[PDB]
């Protein structure tokens, strides 16, 4: 049996005396070799399916992901050493995960409970800029565009490009100011939308450990909000994250561990990246004591989470995690196209269909324009994400796979030419925080194509 | 119909003018006669089963327990008079019980919902010294050994042998100090384990009414913790408990009514003691306005809750209570053997199997070494209790009965020679609060025997 | 030097092993002998003055009271043993007393700061039934009659004759219910008067330790209210009080230690009783860790706090305590006459003049009709107490002594024939909680006589 | 006029583009040159006085300190650049300082208000290990030894040598755990002493920005506690402190800026170091937005704050700051001798006399054995600090200067041979947290010598 349930403290201890290893030995050898070995050993083959129906194949994928974590361990970038877990420690973590939890407060609070593959229940819709850069002068209006949407249940924070006219440079006092201010302003926006108790997810503007740790404050982030900590690529972590985890745990905060496995990255192809994905879902409740895990398979070239391959990775990982564990999870949205374009909505829709049908409990989006273009995210994308989730809930998996194949085909040939889209200020009346007729017409066009594919709203 | 829903206030009123009766007339005549009468009248025969599968027999047991409470009433030790209930008053109490509740706060809070016989859902694991005496200098470390275990959901408080170097003598200021300090230190320990919001159960160190009533305080016990009140043996109560109940109700506290029916006691044998047990489960929500009831059948000679007979009593009582009512309940653990011994773990395992399969919502343990030996309780026993609970959940009852018969046989011949075991300081590294390799090896040995019996972890 | 600052815990320790002694040896020998000895040793002679102007005599009185406490100690009724203090322990207590504190919350909160003899500042006016019995059906209206008076700053709780139609018998669940309900209803009354945050003083209905300890609750008593603990007569205490003190301290509650030295009691005459009074003021911050001390010299025969002798005792004790220490204090009002009578108002006025001029920080009244007649207390008496306090503040002490001599002469010949007075229901319109024209006319008559004596309102 | 009131944000801005300069140019040239220049320019000469009575000389010292800050500015170690203030910005800071504040909560809260030179009012006594290393197993008992002393008003935290048996290494998760746990355990200790609402000062165990920032938490540090930030030597600061300041301000926390000017350091001698001291007191409310400033002149060789020179520095700086500003301040205690020795008590007494008479509002001690020896700090030293403060309050300054000269002479020849002293475990009964007769006798001996010098307790 194990000595004690594993936590961030044990991780630090082991990271100091673990096996020495270069980061290249890890990224270019250990990880890719194990993923390759396990894929063949377990004969993993997704056969073009977005969401699995072959339970035998799913079980093999689960065992592969578990074995990957067990045999490889986790690389600590700061100490350049490997942290190894024992089989019993991993099972202790998997067998004792958070069953459910509440986000937000008062009338606006929502319950997050497990969803199975093809579940009739709708997932939680977490809408917001999704970590994208937002101008300070429209920080509240932009987030208000999500709170005003009944489709949205909780908010995923955007990033303040400036606070008091200055960049929130890491380790500067401005970073601390932004970490606290970020959620204070966002909750203020939610209140103006008549939903003062909406739960949020962050802190996003802060990047350093001290920055993230300063986010919990009166009027700001509290224990009923999801607190983010990010794992690195792949099966890797920095000590900054370890200290942040200790802080979240010390404040009884709901913890959201995230990881974005890269398709075509250090792990390799689809099955390989999915093996890593399953391993990081497990690592989330082991290393980070996570309440839930946020996935986000991303294409090494396109940088989107909704390419055919990344959707398959998320679909198999979630269906498998949902089938063999009680780990709560979600997925983040990164379309290529920008707001106010049909492609953006179709890209997000494909992922919403995949995430909903595969069993995700939370949908966190949408980081339109790949989430790197200032002010290019609006509530309209979250609305589509939500309506599509409802339309997908309860639909037979065989049907879903057919719809996805057809839908993804509608845009997968245009990644390089994805439309830039428009900023919030361009497709919304900023003063009343209402979308323009232009956006409403684009929305209808996308919705129609989805209906023509078989989706019933 | 009844005049008003019965409560502690009505009890006091009636206890002052009820039928006069000596305590001997109650213990040596009224109770044993009724139990004997009802057993024969309803032809109760458990036929060696730990957990019942005969619903007809179960229904007769329910009617017997109900009738026992109705015809006998409750003896008030202070006034030496009997309190009688009407049939309608009893039904009003049974028909309006607490459906579910939350223990703890923040990320660490857990939902307590009803479980049926053989339920796939795992019961809540409440781990701690279980009222056993703990040295002041290791009060926090000892409780931390439970909080550090992911298997443990809530804490059951231990007793402070001293506070500020003095014995918490009943009705002395030290008792008040201990009542408040007890939970303050324990929650402090939980926080050090990264789980500041863990719910607890107490107050344990206090014995007087004033002592228990002083326990609710800032940083200490609050409404999200289980508040204990104990019924006496058998179908008996003191006025001190009545006043404590009034206090808990007045503070909107979750109330845990407890009673430990004695096998071979005033009631008689197995079926007789079980009739009394069912009656006290019902009395819990009637007299004490309990949120949930903690059972604990104990062998008159061995003083353990896991002997073949006490397990059968708990199993039938819970299965029956679960089948015919919505009363939430739990059971407490009192093994003969001490910590760091295989017998202790096997004893606790047998009860965990019984409690889980019979439908208990909460497992509260483990009071190793019969809970009377200073510092002889550690989180390792709670870990086993929890892992065994998971292994048992969902297993066919017929299988469970077979496993129990075999398991209990492994130690029921060694009660008189049960190993003393070791203290927390002896089987744990006190500084890091980690079990020694010695304990880990003992644990593995016990686990293996359980697996050989058919349990799948 | 001392081992540790003395507290209730040290008291318990010593009370168990102190010098054995009968209560008669204490009351009929030790106390009266020491008081007699000290009076002569220090040549104490108040020479008919209500409030002292002879600082040399005052200093001798202080030394006498200190010496009384030091040489006699405190008798513990439960253990029949004497607790002795060392000189250093007493000084440690006197040199570190609470400087000031806030009562109540929000807009209604008031600051309690030290007042000197003849201080221009007005004392805090604490009005209420002052522990007198009040019928359940008018509990809120009666207290509302005090909250509606701007003269009243805080409330001193009355006693519920019944709760839910039953007597709050000590150690019965009804006592606990009343302890919590008492303040909940009173604060409710204050809120109806537009002053929801008014501080109160209690718990009064409860008499047992468990009863008093249950009073702190949501909506009820909190840390910003004065918590009562009573010393016995004379230089005596019971263990129940010791445990209650531990509770108050454990909840960070403002503590009000009270003692009513009896003129003509075990101590003897005026100077003797005053020596005891000074000793109990000191004992308040030593044994009870009091935030402030409530005095109340009472005539052995008349049972009033405003007889010529009891006024002199309070006046000298307070002036002396105010001159040589920073101990915050107050005095309670017990007139012979009932409400709606001129005598009652004049009796309370004499004490208000004495208390204000002698340096009391808090005036707590009025327990009209000696506080033992159901419903015979109204806000009108508190109004007079307050207006008289303002009129007295800043007046030369020589003048005050002249006024008191004349005022007390107006009623000191009618103690045996003091008018019974009327109940709240008789001199107030219960529905609107307004005094009748009858009371208003009686009030004017009393006020006029006070003005004729030289008081300027 | 100034652009905006200066804050940590403006500091960061300027620190990035200020005048480049090596740290040697700052420490070995700019600072010593200006201090030397100003001393001569203003003809500063303290003429052997500990506390000044020459207001003309005091005013010149104030102008010198102000000018030092204005002409030199502050060196930022991270950017190796100088931050310059304008005269108007400095005045804006000095003219708008925090007037008073409350530390702690409930009955245990205390008001901190300005004290003048020779003030009759006693300063606040902040007692604790004063940042010294304390073994984990006695962390609560040690702090309890201060809370049990009525002389102590607030607590100054000690440092945890380990948490959960591990060193709280900077930037490790253990540092975060310790930062939160530190105050949680200390407040727990205060509660056990019957004073749950005592205010504290920290966080001490944490050294990194992320560590300190994690200290605010439920059950731990809150806005009513003093939050520490340290300035460097001399007129220097690191960006870590700047970010911590932003955090404290963002949480509405009471801020305590500290600085320990070194006698014989970069500034030079007595007058020179005092000029720097005055400049850092001013910088405290400018750069750190401090609520109050903690001084601590330390001897470059002896490492104590109570040598003849360091006492003179503190005395002149405080008297001058008290005379010309409303800046609230305190001083920290670092004696050479260890606990349970007469020298330690005499050393602390000399500083208490100096601090009290010179106008300090808060006395924070005692870091016995120079605060670097594990477990060598006890409440007995704080008791002496407090009693001496009371004895000094109100005494004529001329008298105080005479007493100090005589007292310091009693030990200033034994710095090199200062007695090591004993640990808490050696001079206290750890179980009951009471000093041994040995310590009590040592205490009496020191007290007697103080009385022989003219101090009246």
UniProtKB/Swiss-Prot annotation, chains A, B, C, D:
GO biological process, one term: methylation
Enzyme Commission number(s) from the entry: 2.1.1.248
Superkingdom of the organism of origin: Archaea
Pathway connected to this protein: One-carbon metabolism; methanogenesis from methylamine
Catalytic activity line of the entry: Co(I)-[methylamine-specific corrinoid protein] + methylamine + H(+) = methyl-Co(III)-[methylamine-specific corrinoid protein] + NH4(+)
Pfam families: MtmB
Membrane-crossing segments per the record: none
Signal peptide extent: none
Keywords per UniProt: Methanogenesis, Methyltransferase, Pyrrolysine, Transferase
InterPro entries with a match to the protein in the record: MtmB_MeTrfase, MtmB_sf
Role summary: Catalyzes the transfer of the methyl group from monomethylamine to the corrinoid cofactor of MtmC (MtmC1 or MtmC2).
Subunit structure as annotated in this protein's UniProt entry: Dimer of homotrimers. Can form a complex with MtmC (MtmC1 or MtmC2).
Protein name (database record): Monomethylamine methyltransferase MtmB1
Organism: Methanosarcina barkeri
Gene name linked to the record: mtmB1
């Amino acid at each position: 049996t194990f000595r004690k349930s594993f936590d961030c403290y044990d991780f630090y201890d082991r990271a100091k005396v673990g096996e020495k290893c270069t980061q290249d030995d890890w990224d270019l050898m250990k990880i890719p070799m194990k993923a390759m070995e396990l894929k063949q050993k377990y004969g993993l083959d997704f056969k073009g399916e977005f969401i699995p129906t072959d339970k035998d194949m799913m079980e093999k994928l689960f065992k592969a992901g578990f074995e990957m974590l067990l045999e490889c361990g986790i690389y600590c970038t700061d100490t350049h050493r490997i942290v190894k877990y024992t089989e019993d420690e991993i099972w202790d973590a998997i067998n004792n995960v958070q069953k459910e939890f509440v986000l937000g407060t008062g009338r606006d609070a929502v319950n997050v409970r497990k969803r199975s593959v093809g579940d009739k229940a709708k997932p939680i819709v977490q809408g917001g800029p999704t970590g994208s850069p937002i101008s300070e002068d429209v920080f509240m209006p932009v987030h208000m565009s999500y709170a005003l949407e009944k489709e949205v249940d909780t908010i995923v924070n955007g990033v303040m490009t400036s606070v008091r006219g200055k960049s929130p440079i890491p380790k500067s006092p401005y970073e601390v100011l932004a970490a606290k201010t970020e959620t204070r302003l966002i909750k203020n926006a939610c209140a103006m939308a008549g939903r003062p108790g909406m739960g949020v997810k962050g802190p996003e503007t802060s990047l350093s450990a001290q920055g993230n740790i300063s986010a919990d404050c009166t009027g700001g982030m509290t224990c009923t909000d999801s607190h983010e900590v990010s794992q690195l690529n792949e099966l890797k972590i920095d000590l900054d994250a370890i200290s942040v985890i200790a802080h979240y745990k010390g404040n009884s905060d709901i913890i959201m561990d995230e990881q974005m496995p890269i398709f075509g990255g250090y792990a390799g192809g689809i099955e390989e990246t999915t093996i890593v994905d399953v391993a990081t879902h497990i690592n989330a409740v082991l290393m980070s004591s996570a309440s839930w895990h946020l996935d986000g398979p991303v294409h090494i070239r396109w940088g989107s989470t909704n390419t055919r391959e990344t959707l398959m990775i998320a679909g198999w990982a979630c269906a498998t995690i949902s089938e063999f564990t009680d780990i709560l999870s979600g997925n983040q949205y990164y379309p290529c196209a920008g707001p106010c374009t049909e492609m953006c909505l179709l890209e997000a829709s494909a992922q919403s269909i995949t995430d909903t049908a595969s069993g995700r409990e939370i949908l966190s989006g949408v980081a339109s324009a790949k989430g790197v273009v200032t002010d290019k995210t609006t509530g309209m994308e979250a609305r589509m994400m939500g309506e599509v989730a409802r339309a997908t809930a309860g639909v037979e998996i065989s049907e879903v796979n057919v719809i996805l194949d057809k839908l993804v085909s509608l845009y997968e040939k245009n990644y390089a030419s994805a439309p830039a889209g428009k900023t919030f200020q361009e497709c919304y009346d900023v003063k009343t925080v209402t979308p323009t007729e232009e956006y409403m017409q684009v929305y209808d066009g996308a919705r129609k194509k989805l209906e023509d594919l078989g989706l019933v709203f």
